[PDB]
Design a protein around this nucleic acid. Structure first.
Ligand code: K
Ligand code: K
Ligand code: K
Ligand code: K
Ligand code: K
Ligand code: MG
Ligand code: MG
Ligand code: MG
Ligand code: MG
Ligand code: MG
Ligand code: MG
Ligand code: MG
Ligand code: MG
Ligand code: MG
Ligand code: MG
Ligand code: MG
Ligand code: MG
Ligand code: MG
Ligand code: MG
Ligand code: MG
Ligand code: MG
Ligand code: MG
Ligand code: MG
Ligand code: MG
Ligand code: MG
Ligand code: MG
Ligand code: MG
Lengths: 142, 114, 50
RNA sequence: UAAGUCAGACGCAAAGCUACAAGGUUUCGCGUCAAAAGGAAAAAAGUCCGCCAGCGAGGCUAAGGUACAUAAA
RNA sequence: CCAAAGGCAAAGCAAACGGCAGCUGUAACUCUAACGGCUCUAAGGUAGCAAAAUUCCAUGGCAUUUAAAUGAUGUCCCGCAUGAAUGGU
RNA sequence: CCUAUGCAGCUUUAGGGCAGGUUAUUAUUCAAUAAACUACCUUUUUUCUGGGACGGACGCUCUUAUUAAAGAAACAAGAGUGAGCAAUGGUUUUUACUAAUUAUAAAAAAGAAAAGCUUAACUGCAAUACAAACAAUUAAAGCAGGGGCAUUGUCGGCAAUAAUGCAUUGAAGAAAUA
RNA sequence: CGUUCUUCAACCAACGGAAUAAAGCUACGCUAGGGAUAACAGGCUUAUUCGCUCACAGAGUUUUAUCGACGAGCGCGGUUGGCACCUCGAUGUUGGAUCACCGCUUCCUGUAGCUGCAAACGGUUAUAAGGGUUAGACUGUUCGUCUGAUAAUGCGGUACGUGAUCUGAGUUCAA
RNA sequence: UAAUGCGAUAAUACGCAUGACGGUUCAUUUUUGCCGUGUGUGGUCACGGUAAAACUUAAGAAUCGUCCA
RNA sequence: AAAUACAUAGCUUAGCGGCUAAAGCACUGGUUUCAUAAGCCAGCUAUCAACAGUUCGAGUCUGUUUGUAUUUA
RNA sequence: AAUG
């Protein structure tokens, strides 16, 4: 009788000259209307995301067969295309997290603090429990 | 399923016409600025060279394709260039272009498509 | 279409859950897949999921 | 504020449903009422001007008015 | 008419609780169908009565009754949806 | 007339029970058990809705009007779906090819078909974002291990937008305790 | 016996799914509430209904005498509808008896034109609301059919006028 | 961009060959209409847009035809 | 106007995805009889309401336009 | 073995 499907927000998220950080989504589209340019990626559903720190750019290209192609680019901070820019981006990522924690305040906790320790698997932290809970380092050999 | 663009400082380009095959090596600093061509060799140069010594049929021949590859190898070696990335387009699938690329790889130049 | 259990032939007890069509492929399906108990790829054989 | 509220209404301007009807009904942009006294149009919730701490027999204006009713050519 | 679904009983019981059809061709002119063909069911409503205390078309058609009849009585009739001990006349 | 944390009485081949009688089986010289028949006890019998009933509907996708950011309702309108594929998945090579889907101006260094080898339709983790009352739902660079095809690129299923279901209870494989 | 990991299944399609399961009647009804919501009356709307104008095609056949249409516009609030604004700590139902006030879209009694108006009997238009608008058979009726007379037996509004004036035949409690 | 382009053995050594006429396909914002937002007794108001839709005269480029006026 | 079924040679009646077809009456020809009926033998009806779709292929499955019942207002 |  009635009914409606859940809405999908297709469209751009940033304009020309806006600053982005790695992992941020720039475009949500149902078809490949826009193609990935430099310093960007594309998901299996045609989601375009940034892969470095920089500013968003838009450009148009005319192909060999007379079709129009549209790209999305991310430009480095000072137009630095050298391979040394990657380490600068890594430092900026660490700094950005510190800025956010300072603004939010101490009472917005960003790590858990339980009365027990989480198990370790394959050298990383795991959220799955072991069959038995034991204190670390409270037993000797044999 | 077009892949994202990747910036490279050194790229190899081919221009295949009715009569000749042209190869260029261009250096770039950024996508927004013009490049600087460091090598510019075509079958026209090879034809003028070989014809004096060894008769060839026409510029678009196997002898000239190998000669062009050899001349490109010397220029890159002198300038200390050992690795280049090939720009893929319609002309890149021409038979004459493919022969030149195969010769370059055997000579010792490392050509990458991606 | 049906759900089946792919059981390791190393007798480690590890298994995978997959989907198969018994009419198109009326034989026991076999594949090479990683076995965490041993740490390498081994041979798996189809079995009833129950 | 770990509070109250989850019955809304109409004017101008658009669209669906109705019959390019309803002081109808469903969404949407602005305003007013709801929770707003005072002035103009006859009485005047939703239109026009304009937001009342108190008193005074001072003055200038808004919308609207300027032969009588009824202040001012 | 005891089939199906139940109940009861001595594997049977309807004056126990309940049910009891449809399509089609045919006689001098016409009409009608005495008479045929087919499908299905446990069985396919027999006699009687019938515009009813039962009738949707409806104030049915005809006769008597009145100057004038949505009335009353008589009569015609497969009767939307009458009917034989929840008895019929 | 409609609306309730509604109430009551009555009915039945709506659910459960056996606590009188009958009946069945078994046992001692007025008894014990019950998917039966009668009697009795107790419990249930949505909402939306141009009033209610009758009819219809309830999950999830695509498209139309409210212009060219997003979003936006009615018992408004026009169409799909509760799957399929052991290859129709992954990856290399060749070229007189550039389609089709429920619907649709996707896509040329891309796809489809043909030929070859394969199981990444993996194990353990994850910065940062889209969306969003919450629950869940969506995209994803990167790190370690074992692999596939290439020979230094890609693979954590399928062009994309639907093919789904919390917790509880039950069951299976393995491992650690007691 | 208990815990963890890898996984799956059933009813949840009323599809955020749980009190394990699970249908009805009330005109014998009862209580708490609402004009937040229906049935009669008022209100808004005017599709429909009705009226007028333009249109003058077509019938009559010289006449737009008379009848009359496709199509368009405007008006009325009396027909069938739509909405849910007033009343559920109550606005008495249909028809009649009795007694009324108003409108004119005039049935009779008037005034003035036209006519396919000789007279008589008529037709049509404009204007006019003082007076009049019958007795009976059938039916609970409004309505409708019929009979004997009559100058003629008009329509509509007024809570579809009128039950603190009457009637209770119908409709609408318990048999 | 003559190290061009096109071709009927279509491969490119050979064939046509860059001019000139003709027909097709692509500036005072050309300046009018129109649309959007704001304000409004329903327009004697303001600004912007049309590389969304109608509308002018050129000049050039890409093919194509051609014993050439 | 809602809701559940059905439109098959001349008439009843199979069939509901592999080609477009079964059975009985009727009709036609022959045989039996002095002749007509019954009885016997061989034949015949492109055998699938109308239009648009799905599918390699539809009387068969999905919609619309017609006709017929059945229930409701 | 119904009929004329
Ligand atoms: K009896
Ligand atoms: K209503
Ligand atoms: K529910
Ligand atoms: K009331
Ligand atoms: K008169
Ligand atoms: Mg649905
Ligand atoms: Mg797993
Ligand atoms: Mg609420
Ligand atoms: Mg609300
Ligand atoms: Mg309203
Ligand atoms: Mg209030
Ligand atoms: Mg003054
Ligand atoms: Mg004065
Ligand atoms: Mg009886
Ligand atoms: Mg008796
Ligand atoms: Mg309800
Ligand atoms: Mg959340
Ligand atoms: Mg690798
Ligand atoms: Mg993939
Ligand atoms: Mg009460
Ligand atoms: Mg109300
Ligand atoms: Mg309302
Ligand atoms: Mg008059
Ligand atoms: Mg009256
Ligand atoms: Mg009255
Ligand atoms: Mg009674
Ligand atoms: Mg005879």
């Amino acid at each position: 009788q009635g009914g409606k499907s859940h809405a999908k927000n297709w469209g751009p998220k940033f304009g020309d000259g806006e600053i982005v950080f790695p992992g941020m989504i720039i475009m949500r589209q149902k078809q490949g209307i826009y193609s990935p340019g430099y310093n960007v990626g594309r998901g299996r559903d045609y989601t375009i995301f940034a892969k470095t720190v920089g500013y968003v750019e838009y450009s148009k290209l005319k192909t060999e067969r007379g079709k129009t192609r549209r790209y999305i680019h991310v430009v480095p901070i000072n137009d630095d295309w050298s391979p040394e820019y990657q380490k600068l981006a890594d430092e900026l990522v660490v700094r950005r997290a510190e800025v956010k924690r300072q603004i939010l305040g101490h009472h917005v906790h960003t790590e858990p603090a339980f009365h027990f320790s989480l198990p370790q698997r394959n050298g990383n932290m795991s959220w799955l429990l072991n069959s038995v809970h034991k204190f670390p380092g409270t037993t000797t050999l044999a | 399923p077009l892949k994202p663009l990747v910036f490279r400082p050194l790229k190899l380009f081919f221009w295949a016409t009715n009569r000749h095959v042209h190869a260029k090596v261009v250096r770039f600093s950024s996508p927004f600025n013009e490049g600087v061509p460091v090598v510019d060799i075509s079958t026209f140069d090879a034809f003028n060279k070989l014809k004096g010594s060894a008769p060839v049929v026409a510029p678009r021949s196997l002898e000239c394709y190998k000669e062009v590859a050899k001349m490109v190898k010397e220029e890159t070696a002198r300038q200390n260039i050992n690795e280049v990335t090939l720009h893929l387009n319609s002309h890149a699938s021409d038979r004459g272009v493919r022969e030149v690329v195969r010769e370059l790889k055997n000579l010792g130049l490392l050509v990458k498509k991606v | 279409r049906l759900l089946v259990k792919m059981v390791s032939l190393a007798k480690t007890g590890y298994f995978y859950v997959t989907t198969k069509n018994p009419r198109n492929t009326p034989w026991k399906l076999k594949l090479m897949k990683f076995d965490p108990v041993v740490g390498r790829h081994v041979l798996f054989e189809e079995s009833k999921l129950k």
